[PDB]
Ligand binder design. Sequence first.
Ligand code: HEM
Ligand code: HEM
Ligand code: HEM
Lengths: 727, 727, 309, 83
Amino acid sequence: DSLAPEDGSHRPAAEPTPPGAQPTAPGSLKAPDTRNEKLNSLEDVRKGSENYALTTNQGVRIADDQNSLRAGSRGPTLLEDFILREKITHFDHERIPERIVHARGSAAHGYFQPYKSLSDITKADFLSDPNKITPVFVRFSTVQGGAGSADTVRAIRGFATKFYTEEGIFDLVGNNTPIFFIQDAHKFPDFVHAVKPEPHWAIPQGQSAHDTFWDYVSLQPETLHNVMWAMSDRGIPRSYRTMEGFGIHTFRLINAEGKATFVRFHWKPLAGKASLVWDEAQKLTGRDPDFHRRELWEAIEAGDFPEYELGFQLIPEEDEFKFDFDLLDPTKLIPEELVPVQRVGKMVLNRNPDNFFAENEQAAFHPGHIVPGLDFTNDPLLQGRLFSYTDTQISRLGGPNFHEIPINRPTCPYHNFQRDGMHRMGIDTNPANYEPNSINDNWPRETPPGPKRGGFESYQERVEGNKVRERSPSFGEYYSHPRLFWLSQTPFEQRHIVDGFSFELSKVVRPYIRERVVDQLAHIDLTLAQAVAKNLGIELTDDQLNITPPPDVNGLKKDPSLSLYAIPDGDVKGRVVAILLNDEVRSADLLAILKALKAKGVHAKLLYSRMGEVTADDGTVLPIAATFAGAPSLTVDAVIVPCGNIADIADNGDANYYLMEAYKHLKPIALAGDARKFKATIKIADQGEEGIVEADSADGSFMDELLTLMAAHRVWSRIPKIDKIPA
Amino acid sequence: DSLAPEDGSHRPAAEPTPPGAQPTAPGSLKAPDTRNEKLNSLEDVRKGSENYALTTNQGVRIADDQNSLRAGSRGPTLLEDFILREKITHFDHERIPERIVHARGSAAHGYFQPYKSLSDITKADFLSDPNKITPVFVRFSTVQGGAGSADTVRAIRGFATKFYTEEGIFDLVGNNTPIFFIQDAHKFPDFVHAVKPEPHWAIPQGQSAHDTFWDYVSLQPETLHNVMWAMSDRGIPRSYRTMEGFGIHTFRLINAEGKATFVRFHWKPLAGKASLVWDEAQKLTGRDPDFHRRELWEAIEAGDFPEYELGFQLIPEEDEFKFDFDLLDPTKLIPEELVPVQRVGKMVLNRNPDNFFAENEQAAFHPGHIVPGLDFTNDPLLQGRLFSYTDTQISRLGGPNFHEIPINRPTCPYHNFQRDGMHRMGIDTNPANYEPNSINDNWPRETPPGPKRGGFESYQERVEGNKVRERSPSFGEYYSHPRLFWLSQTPFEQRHIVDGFSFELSKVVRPYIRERVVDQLAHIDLTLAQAVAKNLGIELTDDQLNITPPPDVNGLKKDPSLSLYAIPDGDVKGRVVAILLNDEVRSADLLAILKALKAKGVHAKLLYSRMGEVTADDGTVLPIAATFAGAPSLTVDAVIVPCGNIADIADNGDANYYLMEAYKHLKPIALAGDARKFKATIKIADQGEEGIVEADSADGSFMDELLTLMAAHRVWSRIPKIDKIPA
Amino acid sequence: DSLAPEDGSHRPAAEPTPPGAQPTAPGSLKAPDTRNEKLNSLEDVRKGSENYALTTNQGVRIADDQNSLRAGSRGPTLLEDFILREKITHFDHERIPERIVHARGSAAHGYFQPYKSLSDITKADFLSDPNKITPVFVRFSTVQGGAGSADTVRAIRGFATKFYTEEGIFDLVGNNTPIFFIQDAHKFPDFVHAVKPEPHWAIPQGQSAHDTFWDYVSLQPETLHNVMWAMSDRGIPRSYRTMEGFGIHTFRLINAEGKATFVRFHWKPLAGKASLVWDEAQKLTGRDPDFHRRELWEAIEAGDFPEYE
Amino acid sequence: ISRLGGPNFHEIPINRPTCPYHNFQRDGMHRMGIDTNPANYEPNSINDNWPRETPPGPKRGGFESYQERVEGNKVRERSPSFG
Ligand code: HEM
Ligand code: HEM
Ligand code: HEM
């Protein structure tokens, strides 16, 4: 019609902009100049809209898209309206089956680059040269919930990366914890069914806080290690950018000389590790179920590209049996204290998709999609995975041609004798559809293995034993890893774990299941067990109190790399601050606050009791981002309150409650001049308290003190103080 | 490698060659320079093969494509063989559901052009200028059989044209007879179930000759008009090049002024009309089930392009009710004597597909795919068709995005708010997915209907009546068109129809059904009825002999345009002759023979009792294409026997049968010199017989006779003599 | 209505009758006293029709099944004609993808019984006792052609038997020749693409007589053994009743003591071995493309039950 | 048809009618119902046209649409009264 505003305000700028500054938009409109090979190769399917006639799928233009065709303007709809029928028909068939697991996820385009050639240890083309850039598509996710469940639930997160190499797609389909729950793939449906919503009533969505999960866990002690990790703050990450990623399984690197090295893949978050606290995460699933998704998208639109360092734990073939645990057991981790992570490369995510359904929804990642230079191992969990991803995608994606769906296509050439199938796009001209053939001179042809561009040959591992359905006795050890994890945690981390098991176990209706988990915890650590028992009104028996603790892991009593916070890796860029306005802000405070934040790449959100504008003491007009209720403290990392007419919000329940929720969830809080009248709301001494920045104005050290607090993430020392506080 | 022959004889020349002279090939390899807009736009999806590596669909080069991965070379196959599984999965999912009806069909690419601008009568853009060339994709088919059934069955044939216009796809989905079997789409499942394979045991394939087909016919006399056509030689075409096409229904043309004109669409074969004879057709279903498909492919490879003229029967809106049948009645034809066909354009089929599955199996035609300039009518069968083709495509082609399947894609722009669906290819960047929207300035936008490039608007036909499930009383007349068709046939076409009914009803097991059908014939024509009753050994009753024939149609007692043969229109270009060889052929007969065939564009096939070669009297080495049994007379249009050493083949029972068969099927036979010894095998008098060319040698006179006869197609005066030929 | 004839000649006698004497019928109307455990458990899904009202699939009775709902009897069909849309919808979605290979086939119900207990060599319950009868379902087929292809082509024939045993279904999926064309499963798509219709034009239907098949055969000498059989009269059986059947592979028999015995499975036609001649066979693809399916259906209807040892 | 994979969604247990349902529709993906009727079309003589149509009537009658009068031109238009 010509419905946009004449000021062109309906359209976000094609330049990096801070979160909330502009309406968010499709990747290619938001950042047209951010390219990569894969992004360029999708131009054949991108479709514009501006200046084009509205049409049917057959290209016939539509005159009236507001009405069905009827016999009289008040008459019956006619079957002949083919415009209405194609339109409703496409609408009626929009949905596809969501992923069996990892239905909820958020994705983005990016690129990867190795620091140096790894040719000595792997002939994988994407790792052979530091100037070799490989496009990537990454999808982060939760395990249990459907596609419409919440982001900040407690859960293990999925971390899958599609590498569009020159010698094939390589998918690294990992999680954000270094182990999995089960050992053998045959039990996946059992474990997954136990964690998913119970079969009679489909409750609860996106949560393990229910009977079947803990029932399973309590009868399968192999699960404890990963359960420890999910029960910790690892299970509620601050963002997909602030968690670690792992392949979990031991795989093989094969070099040109044919030598196999055992490898465990890792991703290190260059923004560091940071997690929410439980009450915040649970509230955030309600106030904004799309928090991670939104944050990922906005970090990319703001230029805060999520960056990760690919790392490798490398173990020589000769050291296979040198640990107390089996290298092929997925419920066991390789302590970095024993086997360090070697820095391999950097992955940068710098552009959102155009259409979520087309790119994110249909992305198909598979762990068996490896390339020459990599190989598998006999890890029994991995072994079954190679069966499952290929299988599930014939029904999710409607057929065997899911590789022709734009996001999934190789950027490298692909030729073979495979034909037909639903949705076939490629029109093969080869006179032959079989080999060996003479009619096309046998093309395309097999290709011998070699140092570069050769065919895929599996490493000749010796295989020996009888056909058996048997767990390896080396896998029958379930408690030392959980114990190692436990002892590597800070005290406040240990308390949060205790609190996760406690909350969780309290949602289990059948008491005996709770007791059974407590007994299992007593096999790991008595202090953990007791603390959780106590929260559940359970007493340990004299026998539980004497269970002998599991042995150290290869002599290790703790590995600080297992903690989120024991070793400071804080990084403020991309974090966000809430600024609580009033109707006459000391503009001097605001300029100081704002400039200091921007200097460190920390965003702000101007908040108030209504939308619109307020005018500072000097006449500066301040645009309001959202209300105290509309953009709660759960969505920010810190809260700053500038002086002015504090009496304007001093008695505002929402303004006060904002501070209480923020204080409760250990976020740094800064009160300027009269804003200190809010000290009484959170019971802050006259003298002060670590974690609360206060001054007569937002000058001098005020923002630096506040920014040092943001660097340590949360004010852990405040925990005991929050114990009470009614919020 | 190098498996191909060093001589390069595995590869067909990329130049037009006669049927059987080269191996057939994918169209773009056979005629890389035959181009059209649609063909060039499929180049984004065409895939080569020569000089490429064999890879997985993920682009991973395969080293060994001869073996699965196993533990030991006599060991068990390993689940980690992702290369085997990908290849077997794709293979396992190759098939899609064939079309419910018209499953068996053959298709080629071509182009269309009008003879002149038709803007006085229609604003359809493809009809607006003689220089507007429109790419087409045509699919010819049978109705009843599966995708695997025979081409030369007795059946109605489909003739479907997809026009890729600049204002959208228009699909003209017609058949080879001017009417359909039934009146209301509600009975289509009933009719179709009656003719398809009976349900208990799924017999018979591709045949109407069974109990349920004739039970339905006998109880639903609206079907008799299409049945008369099916039982004539119209039901057994020589080729898809030599049959007519019809849209069947009355549609509308809409001009720039908005005046509506009633039109019935027609395809006139420029090769002319020709059909087989029942016994030849039926025997051809066993010797070459792919006969028509082959014939179409090879006509195109030889440069014998199937050409059809598009014709319109135009009726003014005011003459809606001037006939004695209802224009909306699909079981009624508009006699060309009443309303002549206006020659409007020509379609040329000039290129085979590259991959049958990709382009022919997945093509989706729909009668409802119309463009501004055309509209529907209330024809109750067409109204139901508008619903079905859209609906069936969702399962056949797996989703609502079948228009993104390359062969189906419009070549003109297409933009709307439709999103998702299984296998979405298009990646929409539009910020909006709804209209009206302000966020993308309401684009894509509606376009008012107009003279050119306008949006679609239905002709504003007045609708008046009550909501009723009721047949219009004007449709209740079932014998006059059938009779009109019967009186318009030559005496031998009449005879073939009688034999078509007799043979078919002879296969109906319940004798009461045959009697009921015969009662129906008595209402059409008593001569027809008795001749059919006589072969079933049924006696017409007194009452049935007095049934008063139906009235003429608008005073017509016959219309020659309804006969295949009444008016000479045959063309020899593209036909084929079998040349029966001997071990010492008179090389001067071959020379005169081949020179004249070549002058008319008639093809030849050199047959012998073994493959290899034979040497003429002169020393010319003559390559043999096939043996006598290998390329039966059924596959050729005429048989010529050159002189030489006739003793070599004069006792060959296959050679004798070759002539007995040709003879029985009314085919021209020419005997040179001593070849005249074969006359005793087909009991031809010493003085000769019309239909048989004989002479001392194969000079110019003899070949001119053979070519005159061939242009008359078959030797209809021979019918009476074949009775006494055991063949 | 009074649509059936008064003399009742539209209904086939529900007793054994020779080929062509009556119209053929669904097994349970033709032979209602024949039964087995598998036929009895299908009873819950079998649907009749005599004396019932014609309805939609939601159970609504239909008054007029001859017409669409329109605005005037010469008017446009309305979108609210839900009876027409359900019927056309069902019609529209009747087909499912044919079998990748062995799409052309004919089956029948029956029963199996061991001569004596084989518990010394196998603990398989269906062979544990001579009184133990196992209901079977058997589908015979060709390999190459589609579901609408001809029966008497030159082909290897499939012989699949589904054993509804008391300790699970056992499917014995074999062919009428003792070997297969190829050695490793990895080459299956290769071989099958070569035998199937060439990809450019989708010719020829149900025939190995074309270039790609022979190209393959010539480059893969391991195929020669099954080609030899296919080129013989084994490739054109007179009927499914006169062909042998083999499981092809070596499988194992496992007894209660845990002992393994190698085993090759065989089916012997109690009607003896018999085949057509090539010319007859190919002409029969033309005159009656459903000859084997019809012959099997009629043998059973006549009481000439196909028997296999 | 896509959500429930075919036209036999009425045979999925929760969706089935508890009253009689008999017609001539056959096949489709996941067909449960094994039809024994010799005929799969009507009118048919071989099953004496069963199952049969049933006239509209007060109870147990076939569906017949109310005969509403329809008068207007074929238009894509919003009634002015909905404005
Ligand atoms: C180390 C253990 C595992 C890890 C780290 C893992 C990781 C993942 C991730 C990250 C995804 C989501 C991919 C996306 O974003 O599209 C996923 C999906 C999936 N996983 Fe795994 N998984 C594991 C074990 C398994 C096992 C044992 C099985 C079954 C044998 C399995 C079957 C699946 C399936 C069927 C999907 C859906 C994939 C699709 O629809 O494309 N996973 N898994
Ligand atoms: C004038 C009478 C009819 C004619 C000339 C006609 C013509 C055709 C043709 C030529 C095809 C094959 C297109 C191709 O080559 O892919 C076809 C397919 C089909 N017809 Fe019709 N038809 C008629 C009546 C009907 C009716 C009354 C219905 C149902 C209401 C119907 C439903 C279909 C369906 C469902 C297909 C399959 C299409 C596909 O799967 O893509 N037809 N018809
Ligand atoms: C020992 C050689 C083989 C024999 C005797 C054999 C036998 C058969 C038979 C008799 C059928 C038809 C079953 C029916 O009547 O529905 C069939 C179908 C099939 N065969 Fe095999 N086959 C052989 C090799 C293979 C191989 C090597 C593969 C793949 C690696 C394969 C894959 C298939 C598939 C996918 C089907 C279709 C099954 C369905 O859709 O239900 N066959 N085979």
